[PDB]
């Protein structure tokens, strides 16, 4: 419409991935469970601080999984997740804590860590990860991206030179199912 021009499809063939760029809808099924890591979703080839409104039916109980706003910064290279709902794994349990940000009716746990020679948008490289994890989880609403971006910025996040930006469903162990719409 508004406004999808990018499809995220990292190892989506681990499960069952269907999408519609025009409708702004995608679904992902991994009920048989997943052996490896996948990240799928819809969005834009260049991200911004514009708010994202999403609606999703998300079932990832007993699954290391995220329903999240997902994207990259080109340089310095950074990967980010604004996690709205998740399964059994919270990234801020092991990662370096950055504190708390408040956005859109809930506090988010903010944490960071550094991946060395891991799969990236530039093949395989060293990059910083930024996580925002919602305290009281939801599967629909508006993500004020600007709020998270500005908070991360105070901790080294580039806050410019963005690559793609998507509403994504990710999982790397266990079983689940998801269906999403981007307003
Ligand atoms: O329209 C909706 C239908 O799509 C949904 O129908 C079925 C729901 O279950 C879906 O199945 C998937 C199938 O893929 C598994 O994945 C494969 C897993 O093993 C891998 O080796 C392989 O590469 C993958 O392709 C996944 O675990 C499992 O969840 C099935 O596709 C659907 O069509 O029914 C309701 C309708 O509203
Ligand atoms: O766009 C793709 C990225 O999604 C992928 O990044 C990995 C996705 O899974 C995450 O758990 C990892 O932290 C991350 O390295 O890299 C390949 C790229 O094409
Ligand atoms: Na939107």
UniProtKB/Swiss-Prot annotation:
Catalytic activity: Endohydrolysis of (1->4)-beta-D-xylosidic linkages in xylans
Source organism superkingdom: Eukaryota
Keywords carried by this UniProt record: Carbohydrate metabolism, Disulfide bond, Glycosidase, Hydrolase, Polysaccharide degradation, Secreted, Signal, Xylan degradation
Pathway(s) of this molecule: Glycan degradation; xylan degradation
EC number(s) stated in the UniProt entry for this protein: 3.2.1.8
Catalytic residues (positions): 79, 170
Record's keyword annotation contains Disulfide bond: yes
Subcellular location, record wording: Secreted
GO cellular component: extracellular region
Annotated GH11 domain residues: 1-183
pH-dependence of activity, as noted: Optimum pH is 3.0.
A Gene Ontology molecular function term of the record: endo-1,4-beta-xylanase activity
Function of the molecule: Endo-1,4-beta-xylanase involved in the hydrolysis of xylan, a major structural heterogeneous polysaccharide found in plant biomass representing the second most abundant polysaccharide in the biosphere, after cellulose.
Matching PANTHER family: ENDO-1,4-BETA-XYLANASE A-RELATED (PTHR46828:SF2)
Family per record: Belongs to the glycosyl hydrolase 11 (cellulase G) family.
Full protein name: Endo-1,4-beta-xylanase A
Gene responsible for this protein: xynA
């Amino acid at each position: 419409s508004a406004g999808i021009n990018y499809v995220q499809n990292y190892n989506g063939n681990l499960g069952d991935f269907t999408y519609d760029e025009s409708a702004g809808t995608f679904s992902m099924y991994w009920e048989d469970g997943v052996s490896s890591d996948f990240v799928v979703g819809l969005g834009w080839t260049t991200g911004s601080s514009n708010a994202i409104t999403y609606s999703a039916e998300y079932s990832a109980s007993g699954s290391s999984s995220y329903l999240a706003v997902y994207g990259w910064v080109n340089y310095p290279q950074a990967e980010y997740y604004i996690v709205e709902d998740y399964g059994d794994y919270n990234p801020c349990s092991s990662a370096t804590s950055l504190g708390t940000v408040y956005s859109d009716g809930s506090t988010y746990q903010v944490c960071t860590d550094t991946r060395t020679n891991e799969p990236s948008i530039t093949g395989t490289s060293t990059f910083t990860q930024y996580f925002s994890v919602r305290e009281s989880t939801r599967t629909s609403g508006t993500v004020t991206v600007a709020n998270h971006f500005n908070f991360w910025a105070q901790h080294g996040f580039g806050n410019s030179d963005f690559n793609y930006q998507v509403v994504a469903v990710a999982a790397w162990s266990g079983a689940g199912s998801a269906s999403v719409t981007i307003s």
